[PDB]
Structure 1
Amino acid sequence: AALKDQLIHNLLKEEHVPQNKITVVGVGAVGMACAISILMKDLADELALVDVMEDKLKGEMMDLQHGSLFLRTPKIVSGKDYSVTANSKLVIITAGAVQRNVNIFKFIIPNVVKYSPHCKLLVVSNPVDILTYVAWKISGFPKNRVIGSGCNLDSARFRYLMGERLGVHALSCHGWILGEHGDSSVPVWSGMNVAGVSLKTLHPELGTDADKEQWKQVHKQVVDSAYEVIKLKGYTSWAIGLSVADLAESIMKNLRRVHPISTMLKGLYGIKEDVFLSVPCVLGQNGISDVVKVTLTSEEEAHLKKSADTLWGIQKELQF
């Protein structure tokens, strides 16, 4: 008969629903950077890629499949039809162009929610705070399961810059950027430390214009990292990729590690409208379970409630 029947005796009926499936929505350079990083970390037993361009979608899929000998993710599937994204534990949304973006998500999210009703939603698209609200509003998901990339990578970048100055690895440099991704993010100088030693105690001018070492510019460097990498190679892909696989690892492995990620905050940090900002969140198999209450100066508190107003303003005028 067929070679396969000569070689192999089948004694079971492929009753296969995947146990540890990640979907990456959108195969721009960000999405494919999240894909390659997720694949190389052995996080998922099935990876699904979905996008509007059928040729490019298939290209990426085929390429990843060609690497199957060097990976430990046995099934990699793609399609325009969101049926391929079914029984995903985690769906990473990386697609967009703002009201237009909403309208993009009104196709994506009802489809993601149909086929993976119990999934976690990781929104990476910009503007990430509003698009995490849109993802949440449209999905009907409880806030624990709608997560925004937020300032996760901004904090990773901050810790790198801290690292190169102090001449120690980023893993041993602790620092938090919170609130609205980009220009309005608050660098929490009180929390910055190495081996638990407050850098604000040793250098009290830390976080002021007057400061000789200009540590305030290290936060300027963070918000202007994306623009400076886009000016040089046309986009960013690798850092966001490794950061999103970090969030994915905490979720799939249920690690309950603390990440500065965008969460539905109303009722905390003095914020009394439905918005999403970065605060340190305990991340595990049911998404965001718990938020750390960071002690903020009244200036840091004001700055966070200003951001919340800016977001509620824009969010009020969006049509659903």
Structure 2
Amino acid sequence: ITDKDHQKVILVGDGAVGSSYAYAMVLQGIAQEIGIVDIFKDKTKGDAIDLSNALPFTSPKKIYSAEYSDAKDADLVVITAGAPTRLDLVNKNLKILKSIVDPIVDSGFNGIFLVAANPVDILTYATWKLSGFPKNRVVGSGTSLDTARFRQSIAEMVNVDARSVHAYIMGEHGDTEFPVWSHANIGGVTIAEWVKAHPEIKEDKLVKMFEDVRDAAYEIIKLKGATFYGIATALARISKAILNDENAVLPLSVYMDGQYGLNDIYIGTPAVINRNGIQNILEIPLTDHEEESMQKSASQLKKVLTDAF
């Protein structure tokens, strides 16, 4: 039975995101095996060696340049392989995603898909459609990183550990996402309550703070050329919640079955995740304004999915 006490991850895409993700899993000692799949075979071999060079300072792992067929007995397939009209972007990514998901399913893979490729909510739905897997075993990173960025920006404004800050970005990851100010809090004190006790914090600083979250990727790409440490860390956090069976609440792309009056899309909302994937979708009671933001995000996303399929 202890023959099972070996956690295996297949990573698809060895760009800055996949490579950083593998490094995060090395340093935190999450899983015992990482197979790295990418068209660029030389690069994945180089990365597997560079990452392996770190292992003497952490817990051991088998790290290698892998093939889709190595997903047969994987716990976790992480898809980062995303090509940069919105509908053309989707059609291009659907053909690439089919070339990933089909051979992975053909391997006998029977674990959880974790999708981080842009656009994530659409490609999460597409992964579900192509794979034939249950809804709860296809997960997208959704607004996990936007939420982390939001919490860290509040943490810095108020000089508090972001782990004591509780706020969500929800909807489709992208321009239509929105902040759930109504439930956002610091140690259980709502932002509305916090602003009353600390009125140096102007409404316009909060507006700007959400705008900086929405435009974060643009600002980072402008400064250093790409974004990767954030999403790599989020993917490793989601990976730990699955592999350690945590029943952790994370904001993820999850299948709408009536939540917020939505159906038959993947979109960002807090959910409970454990070894079996999504257990519970948390439906935060939104204000009329927040519910409208959710409906506009959903509707625009549903239109693109319909047109794409």
TM, length-normalised to structure 2: 0.92
1:289 and 2:279 correspond: yes
Q: Distance in 2 between matches of 1:104 and 1:16?
A: 34
Q: AA paired with 2:286? A: L
Question: Which is greater in Rg?
Answer: 1
For the aligned residues, what is the CA RMSD? Answer: 2.0
Superposition deviation, residue 276 in structure 1? 0.9
Aligned pair partner of 1:227 in 218, 239, 254: 218
Gapped regions of structure 2 (runs ≥ 5)? 84-89
**1:88 alignment counterpart:** 74
Residue pair 2:31, 2:61 contacting (<8 A) in 1 also: no
Select between 161-170 and 305-314 the one with higher mean Cα deviation: 305-314
Residue pair 2:26, 2:55 contacting (<8 A) in 1 also: no
Q: Distance in 1 between matches of 2:116 and 2:225?
A: 18
The verdict on how the C-alpha distance between 1:128 and 1:108 changes in structure 2, with shifts beyond 3 A counting, is: same
Q: Distance in 2 between matches of 1:308 and 1:151?
A: 14
The verdict on how the C-alpha distance between 1:232 and 1:45 changes in structure 2, with shifts beyond 3 A counting, is: same
**2:33 alignment counterpart:** 46
Which has a greater percent of helix? 2
1:142 and 2:134 correspond: yes
Residue pair 2:81, 2:117 contacting (<8 A) in 1 also: yes
Alignment: residue pair count:
299
**2:86 alignment counterpart:** none
Cα shift readout 1:257-277 (whole Å, capped 9, x = no counterpart): 1001110113211013x1111
Superposition deviation, residue 211 in structure 1? 4.4
1:268 and 2:259 correspond: yes
Please show how residues 179-258 of structure 1 align to structure 2 within 5 Å.
Answer: 179-203=171-195, 211-258=202-249
Q: Distance in 2 between matches of 1:106 and 1:199?
A: 43
Segments ≥4 residues shifted beyond 4 Å: 15-18, 210-213
Q: Distance in 1 between matches of 2:107 and 2:63?
A: 17
Residue pair 1:88, 1:116 contacting (<8 A) in 2 also: no
Superposition deviation, residue 169 in structure 1? 1.1
TM, length-normalised to structure 1: 0.89
**1:303 alignment counterpart:** 293
**1:7 alignment counterpart:** none
Gapped regions of structure 1 (runs ≥ 5)? 1-14
Q: Distance in 2 between matches of 1:124 and 1:164?
A: 26
Q: Distance in 2 between matches of 1:230 and 1:199?
A: 30
Match of 2:75, SS state, is strand
Residue pair 1:19, 1:45 contacting (<8 A) in 2 also: yes
Q: Distance in 1 between matches of 2:114 and 2:40?
A: 22
Match of 1:283, SS state, is strand
**2:101 alignment counterpart:** 109
Q: AA paired with 1:129? A: D
The verdict on how the C-alpha distance between 1:18 and 1:61 changes in structure 2, with shifts beyond 3 A counting, is: farther
**2:170 alignment counterpart:** 178
Cα shift readout 1:176-208 (whole Å, capped 9, x = no counterpart): 11111121112011111122112213437x9xx
